[PDB]
Curated annotation (Swiss-Prot), chains A, B:
Residues with PTM Phosphothreonine: 25, 63
Gene that produces this protein: CFL1
Purpose of the protein: Binds to F-actin and exhibits pH-sensitive F-actin depolymerizing activity. In conjunction with the subcortical maternal complex (SCMC), plays an essential role for zygotes to progress beyond the first embryonic cell divisions via regulation of actin dynamics. Required for the centralization of the mitotic spindle and symmetric division of zygotes. Plays a role in the regulation of cell morphology and cytoskeletal organization in epithelial cells.
InterPro entries: ADF-H, ADF-H/Gelsolin-like_dom_sf, ADF/Cofilin
Positions carrying Phosphoserine: 3, 8, 41, 108, 156
Cross-link (Glycyl lysine isopeptide (Lys-Gly) (interchain with G-Cter in SUMO2)): 132
Protein name: Cofilin-1
Modified residues (N-acetylalanine): 2
Residues where N6-acetyllysine is found: 13, 73, 144
Keywords annotated in UniProt: Acetylation, Actin-binding, Cell membrane, Cell projection, Cytoplasm, Cytoskeleton, Host-virus interaction, Isopeptide bond, Membrane, Nucleus, Phosphoprotein, Ubl conjugation
Principal location: nucleus
Domain ADF-H: 4-153
Record GO biological process: actin cytoskeleton organization; actin filament depolymerization; actin filament fragmentation; actin filament severing; cell projection organization; cellular response to epidermal growth factor stimulus; cellular response to ether; cellular response to hydrogen peroxide
A Gene Ontology term for the protein's cellular component: cell-cell junction
């Protein structure tokens, strides 16, 4: 693999902040990140935050309406990305929320690029202590489908995602 | 990369036979291969012919009717494959035929499996002297489309594939 890649402290903090329980006020929550993208640096030595490429919880009621679809559209067509998506979903028992780590390697991306991203994946995944869920996607028409993520979280038990029907 | 993988003489012969000009009779032609699959061995040390997984030219008039669609369906859903497909297609100038090398790495395949196939790709590609065209595919709903291949062969100039409209 490639374990000569570094993860910024700022990236790490972003992860940690996302798995926070609503002990804090109603303002930093809403400033909370619903989704976020990371990418490799030009030199392929760092995993860094892609600014602007994110969805804050505050945007959900107003700007966004569907957080999952908005997130899917953020996914570039020729470049690989890592992502964290904070999912909200329902079974027949409970309404739960879980952090999903996403590896995006779109078909049209250079094969060299996919290889490097995949080989370096462990460098960020290892630092994402207690992550649980991982989604690997190549095909846009497949991630686009809510059932894709839903099935990954809890399979057939999952009946809705982000308040929407599957 | 991985250059510790061997290509069988039988595989090599199959390639060479496919780029043959119709100097021979009308019987070995029709016994000619329209498409063929290769895969890595269990030990990942050989690139070998996957028997049964092929389309002979003779099947086209009768058993098959659409060679491209039939070929696409042969593509496994969880496993990577290499393939050669002998394409017949038309521009506004000429009706041509060309050999296309295909790398199939389906989304649902184990990431470990994709990596090994991709890293070993050069071992067979190098032995496919004067190949010209390569197609890499992850997403089934995309290879399925004739325009995918057509665009790869000659882009927008190509107006039909295997006698069919795009």
């Amino acid at each position: 693999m490639a374990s000569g890649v570094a993860v910024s402290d700022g990236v790490i903090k972003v992860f940690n902040d996302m798995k926070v329980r609503k002990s804090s006020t109603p303002e930093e929550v809403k400033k909370r990140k619903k989704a976020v993208l990371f990418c490799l640096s030009e030199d392929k030595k760092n995993i860094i935050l892609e600014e602007g490429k994110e969805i804050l919880v505050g945007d959900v009621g107003q700007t966004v309406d569907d957080p999952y679809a908005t997130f899917v559209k953020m996914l570039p067509d020729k470049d690989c990305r890592y992502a964290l998506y904070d999912a909200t979903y329902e079974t027949k028992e409970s309404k739960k929320e879980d952090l999903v780590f996403i590896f995006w390697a779109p078909e049209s991306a250079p094969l060299k690029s996919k290889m490097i991203y995949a080989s370096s994946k462990d460098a960020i995944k290892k630092k994402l202590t207690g992550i649980k869920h991982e989604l690997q996607a190549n095909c846009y028409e497949e991630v686009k489908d809510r059932a894709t993520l839903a099935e990954k979280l809890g399979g057939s038990a999952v009946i809705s995602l982000e308040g929407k029907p599957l």
